[PDB]
Write a protein that binds this ligand. Structure first.
Ligand SMILES: NC(=O)C1=CN([C@@H]2O[C@H](COP(=O)(O)OP(=O)(O)OC[C@H]3O[C@@H](n4cnc5c(N)ncnc54)[C@H](O)[C@@H]3O)[C@@H](O)[C@H]2O)C=C(NC(=O)C(=O)O)C1
Ligand SMILES: NC(=O)C1=CN([C@@H]2O[C@H](COP(=O)(O)OP(=O)(O)OC[C@H]3O[C@H](n4cnc5c(N)ncnc54)[C@H](O)[C@@H]3O)[C@@H](O)[C@H]2O)C=CC1
Lengths: 337, 337
């Protein structure tokens, strides 16, 4: 007998929780559907720690709303932490953990395919089909195996991204602040961005949303690019100046674009605006461009990650519930960029 | 000087004719829009050679019609020679050159992308955005990296598709008449096909439309098949049993199917049916299935292919005009079948 209560368990999470309960024989495990609400906090009744994925706020309030229920043991299924009352959280001694890495693959994967679909002209081709225009001319596609893919950033994610395109048999060029002694041995690294910006056919960003990096793709970076470049930003939105790429698209400079992350994303993304008055037009003019692919921050959303998501969580909590050293305690002091 | 006259030149070919002429400085080159017919055959007047692609037969007469303008050196820009009058050709002793391979990469590339796509459920997402549902759950993607991919057929193309998938990091299984001694050593082969149809998640057909293979995927092949399988045919169509597949898609045994080839395709594909009555109803039901990906025999339509088509074509022909041993002499093998 042990109790962990889960908050915000999606259907897609259901089965992972099973395998982990399926195996974790001795613990008592129960979830529910409503996000952890000051009001819901209460169901967490006499269960040791709580596993809950949420972008909605765990106000200083839902903390006691949950505190009093009998738990100081709470761990997120997600990467995030800035949505909790961290100050009242300690005022309270509240123990949280984070699950910081679910498959870097799904993101690396997700950009390759979006990238590759824009080079092929797959959406123009798919539009003709829907309309029942079954001929292939002149919607010709460019081959992956024939471009020069430049990667901006060389961490877990981006390396994958590297090997994938390598597999297509393309020429990968790379960029980073920290020239990973290893990759640079094979010559991947260029001296500077202004170099990769004019010999890269495809550009995939894989670098944190830094004060420095904020709007690296804009009227100036772009005018240095080749003609008919392809731009991919499956990382942090602010790296790009939307009105800028828009412009590049407008003249024929940028050949296509891939956006699974937008700057004015928050609030707009992930909300069903169907049947509503569509709230943000350029995003809406972008979504429909035939040589653009928008996606709502889906780069991460995959069977393998989610499994990570859930699980790296039931564990970390089991370690909390039980009193043992967990993985990435909630303080994750300067681990993050 | 010299003169080469070309026929049936697509706009997309246009652009490569020049990088060629742009090279071959001492030769005059000139082309036509419409195909060659006794009617036209005059047009290549004085042109030492004629380059040309078409499906209309180079009927019995079309030849002299050509002959009289003064030319007998003609080289096709595409693979097939079963639409040429071999005997007259020979009674005429005309000299011809086909162009046999136009980027095999193009086809293994297009198949690998389409699969990844279905694997990830992109269509369903994109259908979502269009209606404007900017939320992700439950359109969870499966990672190519996590799958077992079975390559049926191991030549130029299947080989290339093999490499890419390992770029993704999937477990690749193959199967083949002639177990290439090299891959076989690395233990990729499986002894039989029923081996394949049961450990394999994605299956990619890359083998010939042989009286033997003519319906390998039918209601029996499938049932061996794994739940959540993903079938991918980008080669000959007769290999799949469309009704088999829909039943499997309908039941749910099939996760996704991807088609660039269709058996009841001659006549429908390559036709603009927009605003006319659509000729084939499963074909369409399929075109629109949330999880099918139909494309009209387009796996080869790439900048690289169409480039060799021309280039390889003009080349070999110049070896004709010049009088050299060129690539791909089509020998009058009476039986065009
Ligand atoms: N979809 C399109 O746009 C077009 C597709 N194609 C098709 O592409 C495939 C690819 O061919 P490839 O892999 O090069 O074939 P092979 O070298 O012949 O095969 C490699 C090995 O296959 C073995 N093999 C032969 N027969 C069998 C059987 N029955 N079972 C197992 N293994 C077998 C062989 O021994 C080799 O070791 C191709 O098949 C083709 O149809 C072509 C394009 N033009 C078309 O539109 C078209 O003609 O349909 C376009
Ligand atoms: N779109 C989505 O769904 C999500 C996107 N992301 C994004 O995915 C990317 C991949 O992540 P990681 O590999 O963990 O990142 P990372 O920061 O480790 O990327 C690789 C390298 O970039 C660094 N870096 C920081 N600032 C830089 C600068 N100005 N120039 C060059 N290099 C710089 C590092 O020092 C590091 O080794 C992130 O950068 C992030 O913004 C992360 C989660 C979800």
């Amino acid at each position: 007998m042990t109790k962990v209560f889960a908050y915000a368990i999606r259907k897609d999470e259901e089965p992972f929780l099973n395998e982990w309960k399926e195996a974790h024989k001795d613990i008592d495990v129960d979830y529910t559907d409503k996000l952890l609400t000051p009001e819901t906090a209460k169901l967490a009744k006499g269960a040791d720690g709580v596993v809950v994925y949420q972008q909605l706020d765990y106000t200083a309030d839902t903390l006691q709303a949950l505190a009093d229920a009998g738990v100081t043991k709470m761990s997120l299924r997600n990467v995030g932490v800035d949505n909790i009352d961290m100050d009242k959280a300690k005022e309270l001694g509240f123990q949280i953990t984070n699950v910081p890495v679910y498959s870097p693959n799904a993101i690396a994967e997700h950009a390759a395919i979006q990238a590759a679909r824009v080079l092929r002209q797959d959406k123009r081709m798919d539009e003709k089909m829907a309309k029942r225009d079954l001929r292939w001319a002149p919607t010709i596609g460019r081959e992956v195996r024939d471009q020069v893919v430049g990667v901006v950033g060389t961490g877990h994610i981006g390396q994958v991204f590297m090997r994938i395109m390598e597999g297509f048999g393309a020429k990968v060029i790379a960029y980073d602040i920290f020239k990973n002694p290893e990759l640079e041995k094979k010559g991947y690294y260029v001296d500077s961005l202004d170099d990769l910006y004019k010999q890269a056919d495809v550009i995939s960003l894989h670098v944190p949303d830094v004060p420095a990096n904020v709007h690296m793709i804009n009227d100036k970076s772009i005018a240095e690019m080749k003609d008919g470049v392809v731009i991919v930003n499956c990382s942090r939105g602010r790296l790009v100046d939307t009105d800028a790429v828009i412009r590049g698209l407008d003249s024929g400079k940028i050949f296509g674009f891939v956006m699974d992350t937008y700057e004015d994303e928050v609030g707009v993304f992930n909300k069903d605006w169907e049947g509503k008055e569509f709230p943000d037009k350029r995003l809406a003019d972008l979504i429909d461009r035939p040589n653009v692919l928008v996606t709502p921050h889906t780069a991460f959303y995959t069977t393998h990650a989610v499994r990570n998501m859930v699980v790296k969580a039931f564990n970390n909590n089991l370690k909390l519930i039980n009193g043992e050293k967990p993985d990435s305690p909630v303080a994750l002091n300067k681990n993050k960029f």
